[PDB]
Every structure is written in structure tokens, then in C-alpha cells.
A paper describes a structure:
As protein host, we chose streptavidin, as it can be easily crystallized and thereby supports the design process. There are several examples using streptavidin as the host for these cofactors, since its natural ligand biotin binds strongly (K d∼10−15 M) and is easy to modify with catalysts at the carboxylic acid group.
We chose a derivative of DMAP as the artificial cofactor due to its low steric demand, which will facilitate its inclusion into the protein scaffold. The protein host around the cofactor was rationally designed on the basis of high‐resolution crystal structures obtained after each variation of the amino acid sequence. The system was evolved through repeated cycles of mutagenesis, activity tests, and structure determination. According to the presented structures and calculations the catalytically active site is too shallow to undergo interactions with 1.
Numbering used by the authors:
A (entry chain A), B (entry chain A), C (entry chain A), D (entry chain A): 14 to 136
Write the structure that this text describes.
């Protein structure tokens, strides 16, 4: 009933596969079409399992650490956003991507951006 | 060996209790001293379980959805940052806090900020 | 030659009117179609007046304080982004919107988002 | 009366020299102690010249493009924040630093961070 479980695609062509559990959990895999990434990475997150009923979206977030058996990019992305249902359902997000840095370079550790996920792929 | 498992406190006085699993998982609870929050909330996230050895920090992230048995603030925060070890260990983060909004208000859904966690409480 | 001077429209329908001076200055007016805003506000900013020639965009930023003769929303937005030329020229930005807050509420002062500007209006 | 005009120092040791004009303008120079920066750069911005009187801070923002006669880092930073007066006056900010990138790399153009400015230097 949450509308979230399934496969989602962003504007870069990345693939977000997620299960929204009854307890508020998000689990799944992420495959990025961009950056220092190859194949699937574990993700986990949380969502509001009792959202408002006034047309507001459903708040959520998740994390990927960019380490798997094929690569380690010494970094992690978190996406914070909301699911907005309907015939053209979307998950609208903004993200923070932190790379490990020495203390001297810590000020320059974190990229910010935004991803829009839909249930069908962009062309 | 990761240095992450345990209790951490930020500059607001919030309490972050986390277990860093051997597989890269973060699990635990978060108690915020600020905002529309009461008692403990579930968190989950990920960290780089094989960080660089050049003095760089360990990248990580986690999510809290602000729903428990006592409150629902129809929102979720993700923290993205890194752990920096030593005698004054820290987790330096930046966060995104998305609230569910109607489509018309979506542009105004997301707060950004920064939290510094240490192993002893601020005064 | 910079391609920046003129009128630009974002996805909300806001109107950004700017002059890019030879010295790196941006001046102009901003009219927001969203939020606590009415009519035109002063803006000022800066851009890279000698960008790279490898196809990279031109970095820039500007600020609006949301006070004019008709409203005061006790807030300011900064947009940071780049101009990307061509037949479908764009200014791709991300923004930070800070509202004045008491010290206790300072953690919740700042919204983040993203605006895409084009030379013709969205429909 | 605004409290803003003068010299300010952040936690990196950078020096922000600003004049707050009666019309809401900020002008001055910025010297960064970090990154691809040498000597002083022009800045310009805006502030709320009629802030609330309830103890809330004064909203403001400014931009530096990282080009002067000595360097060009093909980038620009905007700081968005507020001035909080008193015996230990501060300007609390968050910033976005966009670097020119090709279209393919645009997703990775923008760093985010936070700077705290005070009227005396850190040690
Ligand atoms: O490229 C990756 C890992 C893959 C990220 C993919 C990103 S996630 C948000 C966006 N949405 C997607 O679907 N895909 C992209 N990691 C880097 C990034 C840049 N890095 C630094 C280093 C130093 N300072 C700052 C940044 C080094 C490590
Ligand atoms: O207050 C909370 C839940 C608790 C958040 C606590 C935050 S997490 C980052 C920081 N670090 C901490 O340790 N504690 C704080 N949620 C709101 C926030 C403001 N909300 C909106 C609504 C509409 N538009 C924008 C924002 C409504 C819901
Ligand atoms: O609405 C405005 C002024 C107009 C902003 C228009 C925005 S600029 C980025 C975006 N692009 C546009 O073209 N238009 C929009 N200001 C508020 C916002 C919310 N405010 C708070 C208060 C307390 N905490 C957090 C936030 C109160 C003051
Ligand atoms: O280093 C500078 C210019 C000086 C910035 C100084 C910064 S301003 C916020 C902070 N507060 C200060 O007082 N000082 C620092 N510019 C870069 C940054 C990293 N760059 C990229 C490239 C590609 N992708 C992402 C990022 C390349 C250009």
C-alpha cells in the first residue's frame, strides 16, 4: 500500500531496487550509472509508514556505501526525499555524497545533488 | 576495529547509538534533543568497512524516519559524513531533513544542516 | 560572449533577469513564482569571466534577500551553479534559503533545493 | 546598526571583509585559507536590512567566483546564513561550491559545507 517497493530509475539511468517493509524499513540494492561504481551495492534506509492523507508525499531516506566485491570508492551517498504517488509516481530526492578525506581536506568532503526516480526509465 | 560502534553525542545534545556490523551495516537508535521528536527512533545505514589507510576518514551514512509509537513528524533525516579516529574521535556529518509536502510545496520540503558527533557530551 | 546576460526562467516559473558585467559581476532582479515573495527583488552575484574551453560550464552564483517595498520574508536565497551554453542553454543550480531564526532554532534555518533555468518558459 | 560591516574570520582561518550598505547590499573581499585560492577575491551579496526584532538572526548571502589576477579555479561559492548579534557575534553559514564541469560530469559539480564566522580569529 506504500507504493514504494519495486524498481526505480533516475535521470542518470541508475537502478534503485527496494523493498519497503511493514516496520518502516527500506532494503535493497543500488546500481549507479555514474561515478566510481560497478554493479550492485547494498542499501538500507527508512520511510514513514503512516504518512499524511492530505496529498503530501511520504518521507524517506536511504544510504549506499560505495564498497562491494568489485570496487571501493571510499565514499557513501545518502538520499533524502519523498515518494509522491499517482499515475506518474516519483521519488524526489536530494543527496549528500561524502568521501573519506584527511582532516585538512575535510571541508571538501561532500558533494550535494538531486535525483528524480520514476518507475520507467528515461530515454 | 572500525571505532564506530557505541554511543555518540552531537552539539544539540542528541544521542546516536549505533552498531557497525562486519558487513558494512549500521543499526541502532537515535534520540533527538531538537525538533518534533520524542524518545528513540530506529536508524539504519552503511559504512565503508575497508577504509583507506592514509589518514582519511571512514565514509558512512544513516537514516531516521521520524515515526515511533509516540510521534510522527512526517519526515526523515539522512546524515552523510565520515568517522575520524583518534583520541578525540569524531563523526563529522551533514544532513538532509525532508518533510512530506504536497506537490505544490515540494520545492520547500528539505532542510540542510550539519552535526558533529563526539564520544562525550557537550556542556 | 558569456551567454549569461538576459532573462531566464526556472521550472517554478520564476523570472531571473541578469546582466553579466565584463568584471565578473552579476546584477539584476528576481521574481519568484513560489513562496513568500511578491514582484521583483534585487540580486547580485559573480561569475567566472574566463571559463575553461574544454566544454565545461561557467561557474556562477547569486543572492536574493527577500525584502522589497511590498514584502519582507526575513530570508535570503543563494543559487550556486553553472551556465552550460548551446542551442538549449541552461543555468543549472542548487540553492540554499536561510531564514532568520532564534539561536535555539538555528539548526532548522536553511532549506536546500535545485532550480534549472532556461531561456524559454516551461509550460 | 546592522552589526555586519567589518572583518570576519571562519574556522579555516579565511578572512571575509564586508560592507553592509543601507540598501541591503554586501560588498567586499574574501581570502580563503583553503583550496585553490590565493589572495583576495571580489564578493557581493545581499542582507535583510529590516530584520525581525524578536531575537531572530539577520538573513544574508554572498558569492565569490574564484578568479582573480593570480588564479582561476573555475568555480564559485555561495554562502547562505544569518548574522546573530551580541557579545560573541557570529555569522552562521552553509555554502555551495560549484565547479565548471562537462555535461556528463554535471551531477558531481557541487560541494556543500558550513562555515562559522566570528569577529576574532580562531587559534
Ligand atoms: O563516484 C563515487 C561513487 C559513486 C557515486 C554515484 C552518485 S550517488 C549520487 C548520484 N546518483 C546516482 O545514481 N549516481 C550518482 N564516489 C566518489 C565521488 C567523488 N569523490 C570525491 C573525492 C573527494 N572530494 C569530494 C568528492 C570521490 C569518490
Ligand atoms: O522536527 C522534525 C523531526 C526531528 C528532526 C531533528 C533534527 S535531525 C537533524 C538535527 N540533528 C539532530 O540531532 N536533531 C535535528 N521534523 C520536521 C522538521 C521541519 N519540518 C518541515 C516542514 C515543512 N517544510 C520544511 C520542514 C516539519 C517536520
Ligand atoms: O518563501 C520565502 C521567500 C521566497 C523564496 C522562494 C524560493 S528561492 C528558491 C526557489 N526558487 C524560486 O524561484 N523560488 C523558490 N522565504 C521563506 C521560506 C521558508 N521559511 C523558513 C522559516 C523557518 N525555517 C525554515 C524556513 C520562511 C521564509
Ligand atoms: O578550491 C576551490 C576554490 C576555493 C574554495 C575555498 C572554499 S569556499 C568554502 C570554504 N570556506 C572557505 O573559507 N574556504 C573554502 N575550488 C575548487 C574546489 C573543488 N573543485 C571541484 C572540481 C570538480 N568537482 C567538484 C569540485 C575544483 C575547484
Amino acid at each position: 500500500e506504500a507504493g514504494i517497493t519495486g524498481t526505480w530509475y533516475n535521470q542518470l539511468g541508475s537502478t534503485f531496487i527496494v523493498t519497503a517493509g511493514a516496520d518502516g524499513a527500506l532494503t535493497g540494492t543500488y546500481e549507479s550509472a555514474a561515478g566510481k561504481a560497478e554493479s550492485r551495492y547494498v542499501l538500507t534506509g527508512r520511510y514513514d509508514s503512516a504518512p499524511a492523507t492530505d496529498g503530501s508525499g511520504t518521507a524517506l531516506g536511504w544510504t549506499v556505501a560505495w564498497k562491494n566485491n568489485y570496487r571501493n570508492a571510499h565514499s557513501a551517498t545518502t538520499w533524502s526525499g519523498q515518494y509522491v504517488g499517482g499515475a506518474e509516481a516519483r521519488i524526489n530526492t536530494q543527496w549528500l555524497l561524502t568521501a573519506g578525506q584527511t582532516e585538512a581536506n575535510g571541508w571538501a568532503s561532500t558533494l550535494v545533488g538531486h535525483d528524480t526516480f520514476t518507475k520507467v526509465k528515461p530515454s
